[PDB]
């Protein structure tokens, strides 16, 4: 079992926090919020660094480029923005979705962004131009998550239509189709997809074999698209937020709950795992509005 302990609470957003993500270089944490802002904090000391503003409505997700120099944000204003983190400048506004943009991610090369929207499409955009390369007829209800795999050749998407689909990046073609599916992501090894469904379940899928290998239960997730993670820096865990205001940590192999992290006062909508240290960041909704940083020995 790990032994995560609360280290810091980061206050400052004035509405629900929607997403927290560590920079790939491990130095920063970015947080987005329904307050239309992105804030950047020191990953290790929790020190407030800067606020980044410019979206017209709240933000539901943010993601870092591989070099930790850029951030992309997905907003209710129907756009994504690419930001230079050191200057705080908006470099590009990505326009074309017809409804809220819900989720976003860079590829590993960081020349492409993928986004998912309430308009039920997945779009692939070029970073340097900020223009849309492809719009995929991906789902029949809002798209809850999009993620590239470890070489950027695949995209996984999920939706309130109950489907998870895997796409070929280069062609936009659907390669495989795997309750609303509220979150998906590829594993760090590239071999599995972790999928969350709004029936209080997380499931580990072998996507080559198209089979479910493991189910994780115990938490509450019936209403919100909560992020989950593979934690691989210490022991091999699955980490997720929960609607009972706790962070859950399961053993990836045994499926047992190994720890729950207590302290938030509303739904824990987002958790992120530090790329090299045993550090988790978590964030919560409107009755809480805070980010918590937790540290473990394994």
């Amino acid at each position: 079992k790990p032994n995560y302990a609360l280290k810091f609470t980061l206050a400052g957003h004035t509405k629900a926090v929607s997403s927290v993500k560590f920079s790939p270089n491990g130095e920063w944490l970015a947080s987005s919020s329904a307050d239309k802002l992105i804030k950047i904090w020191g990953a290790y000391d929790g020190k407030f660094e800067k606020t980044i503003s410019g979206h017209k409505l709240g933000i539901s997700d943010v993601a870092w480029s591989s070099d930790s120099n850029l951030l992309v944000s997905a907003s209710d204003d129907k756009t994504l923005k690419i930001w230079d983190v050191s200057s705080g400048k908006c470099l590009k506004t990505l326009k074309g979705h017809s409804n809220y943009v819900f989720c976003c991610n860079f590829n590993p090369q960081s020349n492409l962004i993928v986004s998912g929207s309430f308009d039920e499409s997945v779009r692939i955009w070029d970073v340097k131009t900020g223009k849309c390369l492809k719009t995929l007829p991906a789902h029949s209800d809002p798209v809850s998550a999009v993620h590239f795999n470890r070489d950027g050749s695949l995209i996984v998407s999920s939706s309130y239509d109950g489907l998870c689909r895997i796409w070929d990046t280069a062609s936009g073609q659907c390669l495989k189709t795997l309750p609303p599916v509220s979150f998906v992501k590829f594993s760090p090894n590239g071999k599995y997809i972790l999928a969350a469904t709004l029936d209080n379940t997380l499931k580990l899928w072998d996507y080559s074999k198209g089979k479910c290998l493991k189910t994780y239960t115990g938490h509450k997730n019936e209403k919100y698209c909560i992020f989950a993670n593979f934690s691989v820096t210490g022991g091999k865990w699955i980490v997720s937020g929960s609607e009972d205001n706790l962070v859950y940590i399961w053993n990836l192999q045994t499926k047992e709950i190994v720890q729950k992290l207590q302290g938030h006062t509303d739904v824990v909508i987002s958790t992120a795992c530090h790329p090299t240290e045993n550090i988790i960041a978590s964030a919560a909704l409107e009755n809480d509005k805070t980010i918590k940083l937790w540290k473990s020995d394994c």
Binding site: A16, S33, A34, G58, S60, D76, Y100
Partner: peptide, 4 residues
Amino acid sequence: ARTK
């Protein structure tokens, strides 16, 4: 939207 994610927060609602």
